[PDB]
């Protein structure tokens, strides 16, 4: 991971980048900020290219669609907590999701949005914005404190609060036991395993395939071939993450690298080609008290 570029937020005395994703226009990165703005930056020069007002509180997370036409944002406390933005030509709001504090696109065909409100999953149509489905069963809930509902790669299954749902029938097909307080888990890109905190469960049998202690309290992202997994640990009970992330072999979960940037991390992402890793790093001497973030661009060897 060779450092390639660094930049802080233009015009601002305290730099307030909070999250990032590469845009479809290569060389440009989209960043959310602590004032609810969405900004476009040239990642090599550090030049701010555009700024938009998306939310009345800090942006926590964002996701661009693969075709570059749409963007999901989530804020901290102000409603709407999440929104869908059109990026073709004019930048404008398409839909808003009032109470969903976290949203993702569907994965195969990006025609739906899945939102999370506490223990509950909401599925929306991108065109109409209508709520198509609510997935929640109080008897099966695990009540994960940082529950995030998510589609599997072919969009036919949902993982919500440690419960696996069949989307077409809107039926819970399996509840995974609760072994931590916060993390509800994600699908592996191979479509055949789920990663729920330290537990790798087989979707063919529900057997425990792996125990991966290093994944405790981690959020993860995969490179686009599905061969490497990045993981960074949430800060427990301020920056969302600690100062290190780790790479893992995506097939056997054996560690590859441990990278300690010595600054607390707010977000990271990679480009479609996996040439680059962008990381939001806090320079602040007392973590998020005096938040002062930079974006570092690293070369993926």
């Amino acid at each position: 991971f060779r450092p390639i570029s660094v930049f802080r937020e233009a015009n601002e005395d305290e730099s307030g980048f909070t999250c990032c994703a590469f845009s479809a226009r290569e060389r440009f990165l989209m960043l959310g900020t602590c004032t609810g703005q969405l900004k476009l930056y040239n990642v090599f020069s550090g030049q701010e290219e555009a700024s938009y007002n998306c939310h009345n509180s800090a942006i926590t997370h964002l996701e661009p669609s693969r075709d570059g036409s749409l963007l999901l944002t989530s804020a901290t406390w102000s409603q709407p907590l999440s929104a869908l933005w059109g990026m073709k030509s004019v930048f404008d709001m398409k839909h808003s999701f009032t109470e969903d504090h976290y949203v993702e696109f569907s994965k195969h065909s990006q025609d739906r949005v899945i939102g999370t409100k506490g223990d509950i999953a909401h599925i929306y149509d991108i065109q109409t914005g209508n709520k198509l489905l609510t997935l929640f069963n109080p008897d099966l809930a695990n009540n994960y404190k940082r529950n995030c509902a998510t589609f599997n790669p072919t969009d036919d299954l949902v993982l919500n609060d440690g419960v696996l749902w069949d989307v077409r029938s809107a039926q819970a097909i399996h509840k995974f036991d609760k072994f931590n307080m916060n993390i509800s888990g994600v699908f592996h890109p191979n479509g055949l395993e789920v990663i729920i905190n330290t537990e790798i469960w087989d979707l063919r049998t529900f057997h425990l395939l792996h125990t991966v202690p290093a994944l405790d309290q981690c959020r993860v992202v995969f490179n686009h071939t599905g061969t490497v997994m990045y993981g960074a640990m949430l800060q427990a009970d301020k920056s969302p993450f600690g100062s290190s992330f780790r790479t893992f072999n995506a097939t056997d979960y054996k560690p590859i690298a441990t990278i300690d940037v010595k600054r607390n991390i707010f977000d990271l992402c990679t480009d479609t080609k996996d040439c680059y890793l962008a990381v939001i790093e806090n320079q602040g001497s007392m973590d998020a008290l005096n938040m002062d973030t930079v974006c570092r661009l690293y070369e993926v060897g």
């Binding site: 009345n56 102000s78 409603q79 008290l289």
Partner: protein, 304 residues
């Protein structure tokens, strides 16, 4: 003339941000609330610690005195308000009803009602003696930042992140006025003037405004301080010269000439946002309180 407030005491003891300081109406006491879940009582003239009052389960946003200085009400992140007998320190009632953090509270002058405002966007009116919610107002479409009765208790004013101030009939719960100027930045604070003719409203564009709320006219604008993020409490100072007093996010207390709108003093000493200020009912004394990186209360005294 200008006042000459100078620092007399610094009150240390809360272990988190101090959210609100209020002088008892009889002038003897200062009450403070804090993110540390505690209420503390201090001597208003000597700054001497008196007692700690405890029971809330999460941080406290606001505290207020009954007209006879015998009761307190507090508003908490734990979604409740609590009525306290100050001399015994006991919780007399816990007011349950809000569905999210309670940010602001006040007794009416008669002290048989409490009004509260909440992140849940409602204003609620409570029976002091039963602890029961009498009315829930669908007051606003965003979090409510302040609530206050007028001098005869017939009106309630509220302010919200929705950009509006609203005035409510205490008895019926009817909305009687919506104030809005040429823009609607979040309204972070409001209160009636002592004489009940005006309201003083802060907005998160670094601005305070004095309103004739009957005529719906803005009469004075006060600027020069920093206020874009926190809901800072402000005051009319009336014991000496006629001032407007407010905290500021540059860690100063600002004092303005009410009539001329000129800044007449800036009080230096706090090391974090001065989120609360209070004016003594009879002497030229100001209390200020600051956020998590400061944690102290300061008492200031002026000759006018």
């Amino acid at each position: 003339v200008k006042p000459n407030y100078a620092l007399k005491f610094t009150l240390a003891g809360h272990t988190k941000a101090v959210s609100s300081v209020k002088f008892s109406p009889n002038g003897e006491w200062l009450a403070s609330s804090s993110a540390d879940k505690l209420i503390k009582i201090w001597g208003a003239y000597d700054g001497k610690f008196e007692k700690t009052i405890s029971g809330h389960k999460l941080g406290i946003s606001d505290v207020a005195w009954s007209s006879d200085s015998n009761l307190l009400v507090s508003a908490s992140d734990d979604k409740t308000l609590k009525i306290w007998d100050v001399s015994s320190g006991k919780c007399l009632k816990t007011l349950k009803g809000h569905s999210n953090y309670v940010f602001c509270c006040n007794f009416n002058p008669q002290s048989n009602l409490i009004v509260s405002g909440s992140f849940d966007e409602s204003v609620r009116i409570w029976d002091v003696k039963t602890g029961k919610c009498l009315k829930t107002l669908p007051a606003h479409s965003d979090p409510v930042s302040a609530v206050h009765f007028n001098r005869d208790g017939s009106l309630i004013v509220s302010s919200s992140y929705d950009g509006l101030c609203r005035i409510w009939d205490t008895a019926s719960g009817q909305c009687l006025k919506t104030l809005i100027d040429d823009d609607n930045p979040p309204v972070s604070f409001v209160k009636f003037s002592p004489n009940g003719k005006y309201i003083l409203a802060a907005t998160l564009d670094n601005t305070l405004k004095l309103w004739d709320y009957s005529k719906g006219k803005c009469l004075k604008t006060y600027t020069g301080h920093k206020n874009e993020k926190y809901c800072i409490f402000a005051n009319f100072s009336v014991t000496g010269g006629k001032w407007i007093v407010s905290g500021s996010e540059d860690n100063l207390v600002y004092i303005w000439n009410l009539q001329t709108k000129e800044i007449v003093q800036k009080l230096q000493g706090h090391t974090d946002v001065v989120i609360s200020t209070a004016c003594h009912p009879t002497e030229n004394i100001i209390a200020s309180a600051a956020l998590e990186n400061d944690k102290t209360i300061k008492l200031w005294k002026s000759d006018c």
